[PDB]
Amino acid sequence: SIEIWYATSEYLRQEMNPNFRMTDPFNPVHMMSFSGARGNASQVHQLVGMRGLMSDPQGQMIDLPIQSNLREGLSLTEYIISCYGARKGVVDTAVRTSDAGYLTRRLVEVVQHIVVRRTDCGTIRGISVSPRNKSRMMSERIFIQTLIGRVLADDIYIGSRCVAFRNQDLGIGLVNRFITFGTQSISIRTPFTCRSTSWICRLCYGRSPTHGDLVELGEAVGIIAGQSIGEPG
């Protein structure tokens, strides 16, 4: 009973969009979500498909499906069952905030003193980044977004020609050139390579997260790091 009604509920959600795209492209519900404005496919499924299955507080699923959507109108039994998820959302709100707020305070606390105070600490170490690993075909998307804005710790060569110099910001053009050719090793300067745990330099940090260029002296990157992680909690 659980799995037959979960498969039925999930099949309605899959066919909801092609039904909208082929037969009613300008349907208001479709446009309000397909354009990315307000609402996702899950919430529209609650309105035009079926609410599916709920779960009792102790993890287990209820052996009775909600086979009606909000337009049709839930039965008295279905409405009571749907109140299980309503109680969870309000209760889980009271713990998502009190925990993430505590987590954010500790995150800001540990790195509050980290400020860009030097132009170059003078380090020679560099974290090695490799595109090819014989255990998995690397996804080029991850290989790019991590490397953008990093400062090279060593020169990169293609044959007898230098294509990227030490202490040079890694643009997206260089990364694609590295991927296009067989460059197996990239050495970058990261916060792990700075010669200090009380401050960081401009080169070991990299490009500014908002200002486009290299990070500027006197920037409180530690608090920005703490806020950036705790904010989506």
Binding site: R125, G126, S128, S185, S187
Partner: peptide, 21 residues
């Protein structure tokens, strides 16, 4: 992962430029 074998780990650190002679 750095391999559990100590000498394989040393060779990995040499290849990954973590540490060298």
């Amino acid at each position: 992962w750095f391999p559990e074998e100590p000498f394989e780990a040393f060779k990995e650190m040499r290849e990954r430029k973590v540490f060298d002679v």
